[PDB]
Ligand binder design. Sequence first.
Ligand SMILES: [Mg+2]
Ligand SMILES: [Mg+2]
Ligand SMILES: [Mg+2]
Ligand SMILES: [Mg+2]
Length: 358
Amino acid sequence: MLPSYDFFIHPMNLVELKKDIWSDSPVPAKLTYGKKKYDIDIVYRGAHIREFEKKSYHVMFYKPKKFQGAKEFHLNSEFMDPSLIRNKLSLDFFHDIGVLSPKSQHVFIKINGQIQGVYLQLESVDENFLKNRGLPSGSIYYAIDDDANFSLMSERDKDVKTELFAGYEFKYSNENSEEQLSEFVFQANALSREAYEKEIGKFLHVDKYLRWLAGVIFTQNFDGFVHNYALYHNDETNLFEVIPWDYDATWGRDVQGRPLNHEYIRIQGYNTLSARLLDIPIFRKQYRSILEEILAEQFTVSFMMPKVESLCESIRPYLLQDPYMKEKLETFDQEADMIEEYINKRRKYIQDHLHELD
Ligand SMILES: [Mg+2]
Ligand SMILES: [Mg+2]
Ligand SMILES: [Mg+2]
Ligand SMILES: [Mg+2]
């Protein structure tokens, strides 16, 4: 049974929200969940997903200050995804392969008494994300533009970046956050091949980076190497790791919603940091071992498809009650087989190319 959320948005505030859908200015609202009521602020989120009648929302809790351990969450329509499950499937997969990852759950929402349908509630990657995992304080940075590429170089300027911390929103930060990020970006690029094995681990959690890279390769987020992630600098270990975000264009479909034909991602992935690490024999062997471990445990039909089937079964009766989705249950139903075929094809490609890491 999906959690049912009943939102109230006062008509005056709803007019303001609908006046400029591109605005990032929130309006007050209320959430009722069971018997408990929450004063909140709500705003549309995303870019192209604002064009849909089934809008996506960023919900910020005001009073009470927290909802199930969080001060905010995201409500995605996942309308581009005919399955509504690829983002959850992906982010849970990252968790299962040992990468820090947002939790998510499907929910059923109403606004002002009118069903809006099935949404994916996504955890905000912020200080509560850390606290709820027992993780140390530190900094969280969101990749927001092309300068979040792990390089010294700005593509647009065709020159060295003016600031090496460029490309990120500082979501949770302190006085050291800029310099910590700048140092990481600089050292990722400035350490020689001969110094890399002994020194990159002073700045980067290499195993967690390689597991994130593996996750991008397995899910095939074509834009996942320089976008669609957050960085976390753990202040106790002094190391960076990478947290995925926005993984709906995965498991056999691209960002336009189209089935992949013969499009694929090479197993080495992309971005300069990946390239520098995979020039190091120890790290190439480590990465190969990670891919083999995941191929043996998580990235299999036997293991993934029960999760696909459980997600679909849990939301299907609610999709029939969703005014935007009620007509495309047949297409929805066909997505499990598409994902299964993708796993089989992707497994074969990765297995066939592991020798490139030798
Ligand atoms: Mg608040
Ligand atoms: Mg550090
Ligand atoms: Mg996207
Ligand atoms: Mg190389």
